[PDB]
Amino acid sequence: SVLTFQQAIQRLQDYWASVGCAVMQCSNTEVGAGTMNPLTFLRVLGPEPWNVAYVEPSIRPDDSRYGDNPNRLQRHTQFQVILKPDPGNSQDLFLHSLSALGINVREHDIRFVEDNWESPVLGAWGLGWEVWMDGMEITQFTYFQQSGSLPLLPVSVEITYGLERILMSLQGVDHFKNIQYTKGITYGELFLENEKEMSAYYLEHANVDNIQKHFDDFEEEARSLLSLWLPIPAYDHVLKASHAFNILDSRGFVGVTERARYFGRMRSLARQCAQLWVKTRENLGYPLGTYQEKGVVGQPRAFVLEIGTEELPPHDVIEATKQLEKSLIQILEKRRLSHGKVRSYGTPRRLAVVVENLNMKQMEARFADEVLTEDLPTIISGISFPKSMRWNSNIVFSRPIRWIFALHGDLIVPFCFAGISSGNQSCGLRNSSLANFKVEAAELYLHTLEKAGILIDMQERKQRILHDSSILAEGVGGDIIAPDSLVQEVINLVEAPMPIIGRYDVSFLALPKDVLITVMQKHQKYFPVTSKTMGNLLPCFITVANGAIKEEVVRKGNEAVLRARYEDAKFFYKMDTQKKLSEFRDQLSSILFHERLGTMLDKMKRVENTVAEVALLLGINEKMIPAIKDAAALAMSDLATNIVTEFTSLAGIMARHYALRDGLSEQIAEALFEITLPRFSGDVFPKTDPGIVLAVTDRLDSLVGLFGAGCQPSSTNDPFGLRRISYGLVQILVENKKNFDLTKALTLVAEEQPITIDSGVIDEVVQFVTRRLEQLLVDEGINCEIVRSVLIERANCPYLASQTAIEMEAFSRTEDFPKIVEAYSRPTRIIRGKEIGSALEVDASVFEKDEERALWSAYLEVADKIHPGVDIKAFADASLELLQPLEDFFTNVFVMAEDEKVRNNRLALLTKVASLPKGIADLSVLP
Amino acid sequence: SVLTFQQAIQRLQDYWASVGCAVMQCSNTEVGAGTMNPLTFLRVLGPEPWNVAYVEPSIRPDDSRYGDNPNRLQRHTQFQVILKPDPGNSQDLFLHSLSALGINVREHDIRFVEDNWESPVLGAWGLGWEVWMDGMEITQFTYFQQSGSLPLLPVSVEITYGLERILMSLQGVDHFKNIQYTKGITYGELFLENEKEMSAYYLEHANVDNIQKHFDDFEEEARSLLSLWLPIPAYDHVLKASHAFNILDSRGFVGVTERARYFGRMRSLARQCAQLWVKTRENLGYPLGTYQEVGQPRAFVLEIGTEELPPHDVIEATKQLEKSLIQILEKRRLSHGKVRSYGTPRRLAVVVENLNMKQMEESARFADEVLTEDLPTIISGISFPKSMRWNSNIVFSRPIRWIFALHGDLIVPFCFAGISSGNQSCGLRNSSLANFKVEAAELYLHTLEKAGILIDMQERKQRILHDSSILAEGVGGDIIAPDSLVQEVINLVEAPMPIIGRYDVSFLALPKDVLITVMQKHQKYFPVTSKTMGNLLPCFITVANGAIKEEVVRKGNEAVLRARYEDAKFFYKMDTQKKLSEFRDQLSSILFHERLGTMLDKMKRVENTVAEVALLLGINEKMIPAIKDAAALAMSDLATNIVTEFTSLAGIMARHYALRDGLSEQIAEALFEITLPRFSGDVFPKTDPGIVLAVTDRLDSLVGLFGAGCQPSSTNDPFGLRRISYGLVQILVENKKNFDLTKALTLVAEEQPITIDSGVIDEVVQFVTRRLEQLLVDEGINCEIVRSVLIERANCPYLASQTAIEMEAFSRTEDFPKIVEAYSRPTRIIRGKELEVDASVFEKDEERALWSAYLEVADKIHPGVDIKAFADASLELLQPLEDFFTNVFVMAEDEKVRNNRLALLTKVASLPKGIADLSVLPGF
């Protein structure tokens, strides 16, 4: 017999008590999570240590499903663990807790996947993970950085279990009602009627007027109690205000603007309770405690640096390894240290760089060990992330650094960082024979990792993932659908890829194929499988497990998770079948785009009113406009559907499906899907003309409106995703070979905006988009300056500019290029500052030497063969006709003649010569 | 080493989960008790089973003491267990739960003492006990009978542990803040600041206006959800309404009359939620399942083995069992030797020596068969003031768990309460003879003696008194053992083991009566007083039960007594900061009745009536000014802290505090005496001022409440008006005081806040006369004699008591029938006819002779004579009346002559008026 719910509670309490926690009781006032319990929100504040564990019934009125959905609950049961300060081995304590539940962590696939917890109501945030057990989210795990808008010291670790989820996964039940609570009694027998009636209360019957006035009374009493220096009752009243607001929300009486003001009042009161609680603890003397904290130079040997971390997000692994390699190479150069090949490797738990054949000393001079002892700490410090965190010091990092391996040949490079000393020791796969190992020479590093089951090269990981998954899918007569985006994510969610094929119920094949593929890929990171013969989805998937796990266990686990996910999808689909897409569209007024911009419905009305002119500027025939406008009237209405509010990754897909299911046009349904493409780096692009028009218009509208709203992105904060929005816009225009007048269309949508848009806002957007086009072309493999020189003159049409960039990278290698460039550079350099040359017309009657008329005649013919819009080939070939005339001119004509009229005529001539490249490229940047 | 708080919680959850319970979570809304959690209140309804266990933080805003008191907490932690239906061995399961907490139940003294839980506002009640561990209450144990004003079927067993107290005595710490919650952190470090800040919120800073409005909105929302057929949210809002009310109460804004309105609103909502929940479980199909239900003569022994019965129930049940068994043995012609009944809290027994094997022939069957069909009726006849069900519809004081019935070597086989009789019994729990069998009825007693039980109650009483007085000798002292306390201790044990323990000499500074009442009433201890100085020694005797460890039990009892005495020391210090007269104004916070006002109004009415009542009682007028002073302080102690926490000290404390303030011992004694008698068997007021105070207060209650409509009319006498009137007539008869009931009642009426009509006076007179009647008839006087007297002399109860006694003596004279007849004949004659005598109209000589004899006997017979003078003078009429009747014709023709003779007969028949109405007598 498998574990019962109350058995799980008892075992978690016993376990965490054996580690030194106090097993407490739940809040006797309604909280949405154990985090809101004073045992968490207040006790993380100040320096006093705090190690506690308690069950918490968490009440989220928004999740009321009357018990009808197999997994959604207005009351679920968290197990809340706070450890303060961080003991340093919190992950291991949690895995030990799992074993205490009878779980075999070796056979199961326990994964730490990025998920950062934050709370506006509480003014709190941290960084950490969601923990998957065989693909089931069972625990949120967080290093708390800030609470009550106060920075935290020491940092606490929060481990929050979802007991319903864990029991459903361990018992293998598909509905929460059938969880074994104790022998003979199921979860449903105790709680289904509660779920039913409490849902009825939260969604339909609660008196919203009295509850709003009660919210006000609670605010007033909280302020009163704070002013009386009584934080405990005051925060109690803050919790009551939060529950009241949650009920007003679930009843649907929080308007879209009121929401932020409500959160602001709750946050203000919470910050005040926090500061008052800290003052109170201070006045008490912090009674629970306080917190604190030669020979003959030899041959070049290999140098290995490995920073071991707790699981980093994939983006963080990529960018950390890039930065580490660049920084180390630069420092090695600046320190006269020579070396061979340099290669960097990454992994959720490790960042490594290998320098082959690193010299023992510098040129001209200390040993490399000394130089590195002093430069490596600031190299690691130099690594930066969009989000970092403290854990036991002032040092920040994406996730905690737990070991540091640094070896030059046979010798440790000694240094400290983040309170970690360097050594010759590393960690393998958890719960394995080489969970800890030591390497006695850098040249033995990779070998030893290979002996520990870790494939540290991300490309070898890609190859094994793909090869093994394809073998598995061929075994059932199928092919994996494994886009590179998802493969890239999976590569950095594992260290020892182990693909495993599992099955799902064929009943779910009755769901739309795009729905199953999206659920699989974007929510479970599974590879779908399609038949090699029929071209249809086989009821199969591949999961890339990590480590030496038991195939059978992991398979059944993930199978149960996927069944639950498809059941959620089926539930919300059936909920949507009753209405028709047009009925949903009016509920776009329930979603804020931005306070000073309006709802998604305001946004759509804007899009409708600009879509036809965007179409004409794209040069699509005047005959597709009606349909475009038609599609514009139904765009992103699926944002209001239940399925998309549950699965945000189905926007566009569901608009298409619910449109076809209404007999609407195939091309209109495709337009409704295309307006969202590309959805992510790797996605496909809109390919149908009205889809192109819709997508382009929506991106222009977001850009102009958000930039005029002051949401111009920064180096690290782009909450609205403007950078990828602009990148995708230029990508859409290039891939579909669409000529565009960027400034014209941006002014076009600038007129439709609810706010006033300046010419300066439009110029801001044009520059932002141009820089993303530069990024694109330097990412597709075009030289930097060759791109800049083109974009200076042709950025206003992204597709023409792209073409021109490629053509001049061809130009760049053709022998004549340098001579054409010099030909144009000399007149440009001479006429700099002499605006007189731009103010005069050349007067051929002022010529004095035949070389002047020769140059003038040649210029006039070349000006005829060169227009703004010409291809580079014609430009270069026509510029060839100036070479000899210009050489003759510069050998026999004195440019700075002492007669002002002749000198000015000569400057004007050189000015017209230098003006030919205008609107093609600016050779002032080219080599 | 020692158990921590959280290990106690884990061990309790683990034990009750191992028994089949489901371990739940605490309420996520503030509840004052685990009982209030819907897991109990709602779930005990309907036939569905329910076995649950959960920790419940209970929030009592009035218990806010800022963490300074070592026991009273605005937030304490109960452990709640509900077993439904009753498995039948809940006491055993609870004792096992104690063992799972590390408690050695053999060495400790674990006692089930009567304490029947009830929550009027939740419409719920049950019968059961509070569990004492070496004297300290640790657990409430209740068989729930009714919840939400609805009868329960099947009955649930509720077990509520007080965790703070349990850990405090398991850890040997006398302040909650020093409980080891876990290794390294004390209870204080986690909760003292919470106690401080929440105490401030609940007592001084909570917004009472918004909490009032929130109570109203909560009642509105509960109503709305009730009409929508949603019991769960409705009940949630009832809970929130209760917590809001409690905060209003602790803030001090619930007026003394307002409280009843609040109480009714809360109870109405709770009852409605309970009814809707029952309907909803019915509409759901009760998904959890439904409850289902020749020979030489030989000694006979019957033993009904029960769970712990209250002392009074033991006494009364043994009396009833003996009586009924004797009667049906006689009515069934079964001859037998002597019969003796025995009893302990756990056993009711009757031993019939030499019961015949067969009926006397006068269908003469074997004795075992007739007893087989008769004994269930005998057991079913035993009635108690309070009864309860457990497995069926049969009711008893506590559950019957076994039945032992042996006639010689043979089991008398029958069935009762789902229990089949046998030869098995139960000894002391946790003993080698906790289960034993008896082979021969004649071996029953000896067997109990070897199980260590003293089943004879006089035997128990003698060993208790002896061993306690020996321990008291050991310290040069004597035991204070009033008969009532001893009676109770007799039936709190079944193997008595007296133990002496000490308390601190500081407490000797507290008044004698406080020390004694706290010892006797609350702990059931024997005080010890010095044989030399007569003053109290710092010693006590507690009578433990069973083969306990003397050291453990003594120490636990000493800790409990120290705690109680520290509370008394604190409250006495508070009380002696004001004069007793300064407490009197707080009697306005105690209602007497919504129509009659508060206790302050009642005492003002007493002090405006006390002097005229004294004169009506014939008190020395020079005592009147003291009497009045007494009434100006009477019952002032009800608002003191000592009495508020120790309610048995009312009157006693007014006496002590008056003495302290400098008042006479006479006045102070009157202050204690206004309350007597406080119960049947209590002492009476003996001093004149105390008698006056008691009489006046009782008259005031009677007149005011009868004017208010509270006259009983049936078995429901909530105000105790019957007991009040009984005590009043006893104060008069016992102190030989003459009194005019009617003028005193009128006097008291003119002072009431409501209009008292003459009919109210007449009805109170009739009611009090009826109590006087039952009292005299309880004492042995013939009902007809009592009625004869009370028709004429009830307005003075003491005179009527006198007259009924002496007239009952008269009733056994040989002259009695003669005087009754001599008054009967003329009276019957004239009492159907529809009144001066003119001697000029006399014709015959017997006429004049009768007139003469009557005139003389009349100047001897007056309203107010004794009965001897009545008899002796009336004797002088016997022969004159005979001669008048044989020689004179009343129904004469001459109307004036006839009506004159009739008038003479009327004068003769009107002599007994004021003495007794002879028409009700046997013979008239």
UniProtKB/TrEMBL annotation, chain A:
Its EC number is 6.1.1.14. This is glycine--tRNA ligase. CDD domains: GlyRS_alpha_core. One of its GO terms (molecular function) is glycine-tRNA ligase activity. InterPro entries: aa-tRNA-synth_II/BPL/LPL, DALR_anticod-bd, Gly-tRNA-synth_bsu, Gly-tRNA-synth_heterodimer, Gly-tRNA_ligase_asu. It catalyses: tRNA(Gly) + glycine + ATP = glycyl-tRNA(Gly) + AMP + diphosphate. GO terms for cellular component: mitochondrion. Keywords: Aminoacyl-tRNA synthetase, ATP-binding, Cytoplasm, Ligase, Nucleotide-binding, Protein biosynthesis, Signal. The lineage of its organism: Eukaryota, Viridiplantae, Streptophyta, Embryophyta, Tracheophyta. Belongs to the class-II aminoacyl-tRNA synthetase family. It comes from the Eukaryota. The keyword Nucleotide-binding applies. It is found in: Cytoplasm. PROSITE patterns: AA_TRNA_LIGASE_II_GLYAB. Residues 822-915 form the DALR anticodon binding domain. GO terms for biological process: arginyl-tRNA aminoacylation; glycyl-tRNA aminoacylation. The keyword Oxidoreductase does not apply.
